[PDB]
Amino acid sequence: RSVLKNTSVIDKIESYVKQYKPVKIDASKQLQVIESFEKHAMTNAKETESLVSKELKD
């Protein structure tokens, strides 16, 4: 700011940047899809695991 000698715009953009300092708001969308995915995955995983464990001993 002390470089500029036309300074009446550095206060403008300083305050505008610090005003709009949140430039994007948070996203957590992986809490609805991740649990659903995890349920099907877990089910299938466990099914495979138990099935093959049984077969090994058979």
Add this chain to the structure above:
Amino acid sequence: VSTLIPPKVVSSKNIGSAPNAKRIANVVHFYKSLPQGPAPAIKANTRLARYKAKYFDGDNASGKPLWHFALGIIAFGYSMEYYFH
């Protein structure tokens, strides 16, 4: 994007390979196997099962029942010679 679910779906690897077919054969076959056989048949003492025991064993290729059995027919008709003469 989220990883797909192929690795965890196994139920077509249960027919997917050929030894599954062999497995379902020998889980029955070998499980229903006895330690040793039921019995081989060699004797039973009907008094001609004894004939089998001495002569018609699994390992007896010895010509002795043949000789004996031949000699039996010789004894039969030789007497019948004297039945007709």
